[PDB]
Point group: C5
Chain length 164, copies 5
Amino acid sequence: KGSFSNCTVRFSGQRDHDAVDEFINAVETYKEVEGISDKDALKGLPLLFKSIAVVWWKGVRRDAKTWSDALQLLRDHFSPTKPSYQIYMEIFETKQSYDEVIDSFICKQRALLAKLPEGRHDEETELDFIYGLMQPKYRESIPRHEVKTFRELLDRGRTVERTR
Amino acid sequence: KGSFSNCTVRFSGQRDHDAVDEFINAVETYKEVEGISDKDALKGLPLLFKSIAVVWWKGVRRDAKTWSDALQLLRDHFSPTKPSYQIYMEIFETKQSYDEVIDSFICKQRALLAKLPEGRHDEETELDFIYGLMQPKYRESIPRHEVKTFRELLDRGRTVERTR
Amino acid sequence: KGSFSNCTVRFSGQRDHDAVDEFINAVETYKEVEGISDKDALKGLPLLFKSIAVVWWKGVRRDAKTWSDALQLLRDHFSPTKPSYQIYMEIFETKQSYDEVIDSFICKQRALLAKLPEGRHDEETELDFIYGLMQPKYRESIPRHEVKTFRELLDRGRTVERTR
Amino acid sequence: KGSFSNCTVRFSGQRDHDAVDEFINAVETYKEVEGISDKDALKGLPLLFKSIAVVWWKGVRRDAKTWSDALQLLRDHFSPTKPSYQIYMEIFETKQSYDEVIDSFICKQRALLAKLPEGRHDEETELDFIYGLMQPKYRESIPRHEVKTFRELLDRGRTVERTR
Amino acid sequence: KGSFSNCTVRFSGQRDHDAVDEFINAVETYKEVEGISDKDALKGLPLLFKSIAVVWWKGVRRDAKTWSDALQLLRDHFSPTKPSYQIYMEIFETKQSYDEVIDSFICKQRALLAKLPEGRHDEETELDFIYGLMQPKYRESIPRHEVKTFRELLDRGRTVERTR
C-alpha cells in the first residue's frame, strides 16, 4: 500500500538526541506497520528530508547500501553519543524546583538515564539515584525502603499531589 | 483500509482534562468507524505522539499489553482525576458575568458537572445547582418550578436573548 | 469510499451565521458527492469538531437519532435566527462608502436579505430596497425603471467601473 | 478515482488577475488529469470555496447549468478585464530599476502583455515595445537588430549577468 | 497509483541553487518511486507551481515537449550556473568561526565544492583545499598526511569534539 508517499514527520538537523530518536523510531515503526520491503524503503528516503539534511544526503549517497547501515549512519552523523561523566554531572546539576509536576520530572530523568550503556544499573540503584533530588513537599511523607519499584513512587506521588 | 496512517489529531501533554478527553474520544471513535482490530491498533500508537509524550512512550512501552490497558494508562498518567470538594468549590466561585451568551455558560457548567462520580445526582438537583448563579437579566422573567428539564432552560433563554 | 476520514473544513463555535451556514452546506454537499448512507454518517460526526464544540457534543449525544435531527440541532444551538426588525434596521444603517467595489456590496447585501422568511418579497421590491443606498458615482448614470432584473444592475455597474 | 475530494488550492476573492487565472488553470488542469466527467464536476464545486466567495455561491447557484458557463461566470464576476489604454499606460510607467534580475522583469512584462486582445501584435513589435525600458547595464553591450526572437534576449542577458 | 495528485514540496522562484536542486531531486525521485510514464508526467506539472513561477509557466508552455527538456529548462531559467572564479573566491572568504560544529561546516563546504565541473579534482586535493581553513581547536591534534580519505577527518573530529 504505497512506499513512503507523504507524511507529517520530517527531519531537519536540529542536533539533539530527542528529536533524532523520535524521528528514527517513528520511521522504523511506520515501516513495520505498513509492511514495506527493505530494498523498496531506501529508494524513498529523500522524500523525508527538507532542510540542510538534503544537502547532506546529496553527498553521502554512495556510502549507504542497506537500510540498517543508513539508519546507523543517520544516528552517527547527528546524535553525538555523549560520554558518561557529562551525563553523571548533568543529573546532579538541576534539582526539582517548586511548583512542578511529578510526571514531567520523572519522564525527563528517565529519558536522561537511558543514555548510559545498557546493563550497567539495576532498578534499585536507579531509584536511589533519583531519590536524592526531590522537593521537601514530597519527602516529608513517603520515606525510603517502602517504595520498591519505580511505579509506586509515582503512585504515591499522585496521592500527595491531589491532597495538597 | 489502513491502520492509523496519518491524521490531524495528535497529543502533546498539555495536562488538562478537556484536551485529553477529546483526544481519547476521537481516537476511540476513529477505531470504531474504520474497523481496526485490537491487536493491530497497538502497533500504530507511536504514530500519534509528537512531543514530550513520545519520550514518555519510550519508557513505559513494556507496561501495556492490550488496548484498554494502554488507554486507561494514558488516562491515568495525565488526567489527574481531581477530588470532589475542589469541584464543588470551583462551581460556586465564578458567577455569570454580564454580556455572555447562555449556551457557552451551560456547556461549560455541564462539562464541569460531568467530573463527579456517576449516579450521585438526579436531573432536578442538577438544575437546582445551576439556577443560583445566573444574571438578573434572565432571572427576572423565568421563575423556578416552571422549567422541569434541562432543555427548557435553554429554550426559554434563547427567547429572552432575542427579545433584549 | 470511506466515511468522513479527514478533511480541512471543521467547526469551532464562532457564533456567526456565515461560518455555520458554510460548514453545514459543505458537509451536506460532501455527503451527497461521496455517497454515504445516513446511518453511517452519524457515527463519524465527532471527527470534525475540534474546540469547545466537542465538549458540547459530549453532553448532547443522546438527543440525536437521525441525520436531519442532528443537523437541525446544530443549526438551532448556534445560529440564533435573528428577528425581522433587527435585519430591517441593519440594512439601512450602513451606506456604501466611497472607493468600494460593486460586487462585494451586492453579495453582502444579498446574504443579508436571505435571512428573512422565504416568500415575503419579490425581485422588484428586492431591487427597490437596494437602490436607495448606492453612491452618487453610480446613480448619476443609470436611472430607475431601466434595470428590471438583479443581474443588469451588476452588468451596468461593471461598465461604469471600467470607464472611471 | 474520486471527484474533488480535497486539495490545497482554494479561492477567496482577492480581486486580482494572477490569482484568479492561476486557480482556474489549476482546476481546469486537474480535471483533465484525473479524468472527471462534466456532470460530476459541478456537484463538487462548493468544496473549494472557503471565504466571502461561498456566500457568493449561495446566491448565484441557479444561474449555472454547465461547467463552461460556471467557469466563464467565475471569470466574469472577479476578473474585471481592464481596457486597453490602462494597459498601455501601465507598461510605460515603471522602468527597470537597478539591481533586479532579468528573468523577473521579462516574465512580469509578458504576463502584462498577455492581457491585450489576441492577434493584435507580432513577435517583433512585442520585443520592440520591451526594448525601450531596460537599464544601461544591459543596453551598452547588445544592440538592436541582432536579437530576432524573444529567447535570445534572455540568452544574451544571462551572459552579461554572469560577467558583471 | 495516481499521477502527481498533491504533495507538500512545491516551488516558488526563490533564486538559489539549494532549493532548486532539492525540488528537482525530490520530484525526479518521486517519479521513479511511484512509477509514472514520461508522457503522463508532463500534463501534471502545473499542479506544483504556486507563485510567480506559474505566471512563468503560462508563457513558456509551448517550448517544452519532453520531460528532460522541461527539467533542463527549469534548471536553466533559475539556477544561474555561476562561473569558477566566484566559487574559488567564495571558498576562501569565510573561515570557520569559533563554537561551530564540524558536520555543518563539512557539509556546507562539500555542497559548495559540488558546483565545479566534474572530473577536475581528485579526493586528495579536495581535502587539501579544506584543510587550510579550520580552527586551531582541531588543528593542534590531528596533523596532515595521517588522514587519507574524507571520512577519517570527521571520524577524528567527532572524537576531539566529545573530549573538549
